[PDB]
Design an enzyme around this catalytic site. Sequence first.
Site, PDB file in Angstrom:
ATOM      1  N   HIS A 245       1.129  -5.911  17.949  1.00 46.77           N
ATOM      2  CA  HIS A 245       0.048  -6.868  18.003  1.00 46.77           C
ATOM      3  C   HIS A 245      -0.522  -7.009  19.414  1.00 46.77           C
ATOM      4  O   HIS A 245       0.058  -6.605  20.417  1.00 46.77           O
ATOM      5  CB  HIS A 245       0.603  -8.209  17.528  1.00 46.77           C
ATOM      6  CG  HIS A 245       1.602  -8.735  18.538  1.00 46.77           C
ATOM      7  ND1 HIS A 245       2.944  -8.538  18.445  1.00 46.77           N
ATOM      8  CD2 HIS A 245       1.354  -9.520  19.666  1.00 46.77           C
ATOM      9  CE1 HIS A 245       3.481  -9.181  19.503  1.00 46.77           C
ATOM     10  NE2 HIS A 245       2.553  -9.778  20.249  1.00 46.77           N
TER      11      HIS A 245
ATOM     12  N   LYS B 288       0.836  -1.188   0.000  1.00 48.67           N
ATOM     13  CA  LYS B 288       0.000   0.000   0.000  1.00 48.67           C
ATOM     14  C   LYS B 288       0.878   1.247   0.000  1.00 48.67           C
ATOM     15  O   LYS B 288       0.480   2.293  -0.508  1.00 48.67           O
ATOM     16  CB  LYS B 288      -0.927   0.007   1.217  1.00 48.67           C
ATOM     17  CG  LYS B 288      -2.072  -0.998   1.126  1.00 48.67           C
ATOM     18  CD  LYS B 288      -2.935  -0.951   2.379  1.00 48.67           C
ATOM     19  CE  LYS B 288      -4.073  -1.961   2.313  1.00 48.67           C
ATOM     20  NZ  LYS B 288      -4.701  -2.184   3.649  1.00 48.67           N
TER      21      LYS B 288
END
Lengths: 116, 116, 110
Positions: free
Chosen positions: A103, A62
């Site tokens: 995370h 991206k």
Amino acid sequence: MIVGHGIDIEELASIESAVTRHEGFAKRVLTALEMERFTSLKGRRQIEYLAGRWSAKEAFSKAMGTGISKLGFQDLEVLNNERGAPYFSQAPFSGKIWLSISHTDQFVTASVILEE
Amino acid sequence: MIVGHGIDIEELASIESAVTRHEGFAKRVLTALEMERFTSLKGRRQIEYLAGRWSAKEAFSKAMGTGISKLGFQDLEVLNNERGAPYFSQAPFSGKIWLSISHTDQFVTASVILEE
Amino acid sequence: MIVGHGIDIEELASIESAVTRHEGFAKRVLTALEMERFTSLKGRRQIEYLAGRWSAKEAFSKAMGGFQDLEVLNNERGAPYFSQAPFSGKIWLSISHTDQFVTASVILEE
């Protein structure tokens, strides 16, 4: 000069489900070097490692302004530097790649900034 | 030089509930061009489009140091280029706007970095 | 030029459990000024504040490569920013959250 920015958030459940189904998943996503660490890990950590690499590569694509399906997972590689931080050891970019992964027990996120 | 940075996360469910308590919710959040895209999608993808646009516009507003309700939804426009990547086609900023959007089944996150 | 970049996601549960486990958790995570805010808040908003600060400091620490030497306050527009940090360049911080977790993004520029 910034030349790209990409982010990504992924549910670990989706990654764990993918691994549980077909063994070819991790293999498609990770390079040989990455597989070495992936297979050396246990339980949650093992899935987290894969998920993080998936997220990082997705974020990088991206950052370049396209999809991972055009670059290819094997075209990217995320190892850990001497300070222990993940970094792109392999990527189609000449400048600096700022990467960060984080995370929880349920999600993994990654952010990439390309600099020239 | 970086002149701003913002991130935002939105729950798809909240967006849809809003599309419920206010029939013209979408119309106020999206420009005419964004509406034309929105009206051409369906189901999950339609909601995701709207929610992602909200995230992007809020991430940008925060990058400008404020909020979307203050900046105005109609003064920001996020379209998709030839490669399918989201980008600001309209914004009260003369520099470069680096946008990235990512989502799970329940959430959509956006990250914006402003550069002069 | 960018000299660092760090992000963090943190589930509210890890923070909620941590607060209970040791009542001095917040005091250890937040400076005196930050605590004043923490204490003035209540319920979900209070937990969110603590979690957002923990998240932001973690993001900053990762960007650099004691949470007491880090301070995040809110400006007049309500935006969070680092009022104190072992870095003399510009610190671009942004925090956001859902009902279950908070996320923070930091970019260090010189």
